[PDB]
Symmetry: D3
Subunit: 322 residues, 6 copies
């Protein structure tokens, strides 16, 4: 097949984390399959069906842990596939794909704003919120509370290795919101002054567990220790279907040099391995609520979300396999 | 009034953390009083005594949290004050200062070795040990356990903001000990593969609480969650006598530029505040044993140590006070 | 505009807690709309509709915390609004109001009986049951379990400030049930001899949290400490629909004179403040089952109840709104 | 009244535990109803109906605790009863019984194989797994996982008093899976090396609680204590419908001679009572997942399995009742 | 013997709680034996030795739970007894007793002030302290913090049945300290805003447990749940010797009419018992520190306090028995 | 080198558990050293010294886990050694051995009777008590309490694999104390009716941990879970001095044939390993008190027993060493 440069570029930028955050990655992936259909030179349906099957594969093998990614691809390709198998002519298939992808992206933007409006009602005036990493969903909650005239402060953890915390700090500060920036080690120390914890998700499992940025389970643990509510702001497409049938989520191991720079690590002894997991898994008992765009749920209700929105596709193969 | 430059240099090097770690700061301060006494140009005992008090005050107003520092000064200065008030001539006072300093330095070095011999018996063949910061006492234990031919592997947390973990990592590696280097956020993610936690202490309170490097309480917290033994390696001069009479330990807040470099930090808006606590406080429920030069205690026996060795001095003011 | 006195009287009697308990306040409000509709002098459907909305608003602005109240009003008013907008004549609208009110009252009475039949199966011969406040639903369970010939004994907490326990105590005593009457402070002291806890609920949230009489969370807390089952007896109209979209329940602060009588309270200085929260919030981890007219659920299934029966109305404004 | 001898043999063998394990009991009760229809010499439909009703009672009154048994009889008799009331002639009734028994028995075999497939994905390479009793569903998970190439090892608790663990230890060994065999009391001592716990269920309640072999809750508790996953492998017919309406599962007390043999117990004084409860009840807070043949759920979702597969039957009486 | 009216009056006032609080009761008891020696008309030593033996017995059988009482008596009578057995003439014995009692009372007043100075160092500026009952020791801590210019607020629980909270509220408010008065049920509700808990003791056991006013264990439980420090301000004479040798402290049951007034309770049904325990027992794990006048200790160190101050008298009988 | 046959018989019987229970082992080892001195045909002092050293090694190398054994040998041999070095002649050395054995053996009997007296005060009328294994100290507490008139009942866990619980069940019955006998696995199921837990100890560490029969920690854990007191009845010679200097207690692994009999185990495949640990280790957080013959302590005070009765010996080598 013949793939546009924007599919390859998006894939490179996902791997390299130049494009990041699970929501954004998912949009970008959908935006890429969309450009593959805008610019395709295919002459018959099957040509295009193949181009999109292969673009999807390229995009799926970028970063494993956030299921937002394959859900975006599935949203586009369940539709694209059903068009092709119902003999849609070429231009019918091109629109299915473009339009499916415009839907997903639009709904993504809609879901986040909505998560913001819902989750803000759980923020009280004077609250001190602790967050982790950079999460567009968590930030929608925090930003919306602030706009309601609640007087909040946000404790931003710096989030090693990759410093996502700086993005979070600067962003919140530019909306007017007072920020307190601390190291990830300082979470328990400052949990006493924290009223709420608000974080994102990359994958939510059938049984309620939240895969999110490494260190998430620690902040959640000590929030529980102190009875601070842990609220996970997370779209429906963050929920992981394959977990319904027994699958464990893959925990992405990133390059050691994100931790110790190349210039330095090459000088270190050989009997030191550097391990850089990108995510950990917080158990549901440490979670108060998941704020989805369909409303507040307890974490154990993740399986209802999956039953009714994702269950069907499990008896089928992936809509890009052959 | 006529203080030598070695005193001034030590003070600067303790502030800047060029000289660092609780035990070594203690030794560096004994040492500084030693050099003050050795090089003094005083001709009257009253005049040397004055120098030693002023030097003590300078060394004391460097870093508050590690109680080892004022315990080192006290060890020297109780003995110097008793000699002075007993009517000692110049040269007898000069030697009390010097010889006391030397007693302390020698005792500190012996205590760490002994702590290693004692702690290492609680390490078992095959153990995976998680540690935090750079602690000579913690390292003595791991070091010795390896020398005994136990095959151990040490998980080393990077310890932000100042990166003390790099020191620990390279040091353990240098003795032959395999290391796994993780960011602080990953401590819960890797506690399932950890068999023991072994950290040091800056101060230990009357009720058994351990003030140590920021993040220590989190590691202890999830170690408890998992039933991993938390062993604190600590000399008796880590115990905090003022806490017997209700004093809380001051937690050092250090330069924000440690967290976010100056060059970057000036580009940030007013409404972000960087907060840099260098320590936190781990409760005694989360600590299995404290390993001292006199043996293994439960954290609650911290009061015994304080009683039998430090309490006698609490009726008197500080031996460097006018 | 032309509101009968029965509406005004009910409102006053709900405020003063002459009429009280979540379920009975709900019935008293249906009933009040019923009498408004029965006695209306309106000649146009638009005019009755106006009366019913104004009456609803008056009944709603009485006490906030028990969600039963606005669920009772909604049950009537959804049906009255659909009939009105469907073009009903005066007498058809009058009967929709009356007959809906009656449906609710009848359903409330049936639900409590059914809750008793269901809950009582979880009581066993010889049980010592601790309760709190006066809850008709809780009492239905204890009542029925005794009628089944189980020899039960009920520990009754006095329930300050308003002494609801006296009602419970005398009521249980009147059916033949032995009572042990303790102050609220003794709940932990007597939890070792307690086999079951059975309390009611004013509101129950989307994540399974139970808002109930002040002190409920303490009893639940130490019941958990001891592994005593905490069973919440509660009708479906206790479930809080606004919480599905992130609303927190308002906790009523009531007159300080309830706590400290007026006569005494005026002799106290400015700088004492009496605070009288009438409710508190028990987390779902501390609740074994919720017993509803439809059966036994785990607290987390509170969302199911809300979804299948209340969620449909959250896109529309309140059925008494202009 | 004309009951075939196969029915009486099944009943005897269920009572004396020659046939045992919740699923195998279910299949054996269905098999007996099947053999009753095949071998019946009934000339009228009404006459067969009476034999099956009566067989269903003989079988139900064997061992009470595993709901699998009554759920098997319900499966057959619900259908046999709906035929009989639609006026089915004799050979139509005989077939409804025979075929319903056959679907239940095939669906049982299918569910367990599929549990094995689903549950094996939560087993990771290297895993050490503790189990308890002998569960065909637990064993399916362990066996599949091994067949996938995962080098596992299984800790088999011996399971007093009836020694179920010997059956488990021989079986798993016979597939080439290395077994560690231990006494029940040693579960906590070896929970530190255990990665995963996998057990069966006899009945699962509406609120998530799991009834299973005596000891199961002790193992669940120490596994929670050590953050080891407890995974319950249970067919959907192990869920207990009566629990929806408040019922408590009866805990079978079996012969004391299973504990102390008869020749020894005869000599013991009267003032020693030997209590042999065959089951206990684990809270859902100590359960990570239930692995059913329709997927992985959190324990709290047991109510959904029940609501949608069994709730319908509750408003009627038992199909084998008059 | 012939006992002065002040021994009988003090005893009546202890029983009736007109004189109350464990410290005060102890002083008053000592003050009474003192007046029995001031006013005695005895002519020989043995006469007076008998008068004081019998006065002591009268005073001991007033209220059981606070050991401050018998420790006061023992302080006076261990001395008085050793005088008499070393043939002290009459006037020697009269002074021993008077002077012993003046010592105890003076030291009591000294210990409380001291407990105040120590415990205040654990109060931080801005703190919100929750307390319970009326405790002179707890109040010494709170008052002293306030005098140091710390800006505190105290949550006073009302303390049923006897309303000791009103005494506490009014007293603290008259020293200038802002008070928030709440019911005992509201403790968990307001534990989120509380920074510290400070309470008294009536008896402290060998193993660390604190007997204090009913409801104390509840406040401590939820303080632990929220990681609020529980600080028990308690003199050395609050520690219970008999617990060293296995004794459980008697939990005083007071008259039911303290709960339900006479006028009301006589009208209540016969199958309602009212139980009024005056104290409960908080376990040591819920206690951070005991502030004694000899300094801060962990609760497990209570046995050291008893070993060294009370151990000796245990091999002997009580100094008023014969 | 001339070792009497009584020594070899004691050693055999300790190894095969014909003599068992930590205290009874101690008495039997002392008895053997006693019979060695009595029957020795040694002509020089040096010759007897060698026989006792050698007997002490034979006895020490039987069963490692109960420190009672080495503490008995230490008791004798410390004294025998100090005599030998003061130049004691032959019959003086023979007597030091004989008498030291006799004091240890009488002090053992006295300690257990006194443990019984002290511990029985923590048993209240009506109490149901769970125990484990067969402990002579635990049994002293249960027996005394019964003799005081307290109507108790005892739950005897059976204690696999060696069936110790049968010995306990017969014994207590023989004193007229009603026994409930159960399998080990049923400890949690019956912990709800248990009021008190009372067990022995084989070794108690410096930090409070209790080593005792396999299962003891499972029972301690579920007792903590249900807020039931765990009371450990232990003579002061059960405290382990080596633990002060970092030692870990060795956990004896006994024959697999104790678990599965030899005639059965021979048939089992090789890929089943049977592990029979005879002890486990309970944390001090799950222990309410240790009841020694010098009083009730919290588990954390084990270090004081040790410091002041055993610490002296640590700087030397074993008295029976060269
Ligand atoms: O874990 C991360 C970032 O992962 P990375 O930075 O490694 O991509 C975020 O908290 C979630 O992805 C949610 O973000 P959002 O709510 O914006 O989807
Ligand atoms: O917290 C630190 C060092 O802080 P810093 O790096 O700020 O001095 C170490 O864990 C202890 O001080 C122990 O040191 P040691 O065991 O070496 O005495
Ligand atoms: O908290 C209360 C009453 O508050 P108040 O006395 O302030 O109304 C009751 O526990 C519930 O409302 C249950 O009532 P029921 O079960 O009777 O509906
Ligand atoms: O407790 C038992 C059976 O006990 P018993 O031996 O008393 O019947 C098993 O764990 C379950 O029945 C599940 O087994 P399966 O998964 O094989 O149904
Ligand atoms: O329990 C009470 C009062 O008992 P009562 O009011 O029943 O006498 C107090 O908290 C303690 O006695 C300590 O008070 P103090 O520190 O003043 O001794
Ligand atoms: O675990 C055992 C003995 O096991 P074993 O049977 O293996 O020796 C007993 O609980 C203790 O030794 C205490 O007994 P006592 O109090 O009688 O010393
Ligand atoms: K907080
Ligand atoms: K571990
Ligand atoms: K109980
Ligand atoms: K483990
Ligand atoms: K707080
Ligand atoms: K109990």
């Amino acid at each position: 097949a013949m793939i546009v440069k924007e599919v390859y570029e998006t894939a490179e930028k996902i791997k390299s984390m130049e494009i990041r955050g699970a929501g954004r990655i998912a949009r970008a992936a959908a935006q890429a399959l969309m450009i593959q259909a805008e610019k395709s030179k295919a002459k018959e349906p099957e040509e295009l069906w193949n181009e999109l099957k292969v673009a999807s594969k390229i995009l799926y093998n970028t970063r494993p842990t956030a299921v937002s990614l394959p859900n975006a691809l599935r949203y586009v390709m369940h539709r694209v596939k059903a068009a092709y198998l119902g003999g849609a002519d070429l231009e019918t298939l091109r629109f299915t794909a473009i339009n499916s992808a415009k839907e997903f992206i639009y709904n993504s933007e809609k879901a986040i704003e909505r998560i913001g409006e819902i989750g803000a009602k759980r923020i009280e005036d004077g609250d001190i919120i602790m967050t982790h990493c950079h999460s567009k969903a968590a930030i929608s909650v925090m930003k919306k509370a602030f706009e309601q005239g609640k007087n909040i402060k946000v404790i931003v953890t710096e989030t090693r290795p990759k410093w996502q915390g700086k993005i979070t700090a600067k962003e919140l500060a530019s909306y007017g919101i007072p920020v307190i920036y601390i190291v990830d080690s300082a979470a328990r120390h400052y949990m006493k002054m924290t009223d709420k914890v608000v974080m994102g998700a990359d994958s939510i499992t059938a049984n309620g567990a939240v895969i999110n940025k490494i260190g998430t389970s620690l902040i959640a643990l000590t929030a529980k220790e102190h009875r601070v509510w842990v609220m996970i702001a997370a779209e429906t497409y963050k929920f992981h279907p394959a977990t319904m049938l027994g699958q464990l989520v893959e925990i992405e191991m990133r390059d050691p040099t994100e931790v110790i720079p190349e210039e330095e690590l090459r000088t270190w002894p050989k009997n030191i391995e550097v391990w850089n997991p990108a995510f950990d898994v917080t158990p549901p008992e440490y979670i108060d609520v998941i704020i989805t765009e369909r409303g507040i749920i307890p974490p154990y209700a993740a399986i209802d979300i999956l039953k009714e929105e994702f269950g069907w596709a499990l008896k089928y193969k992936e809509p890009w396999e052959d």
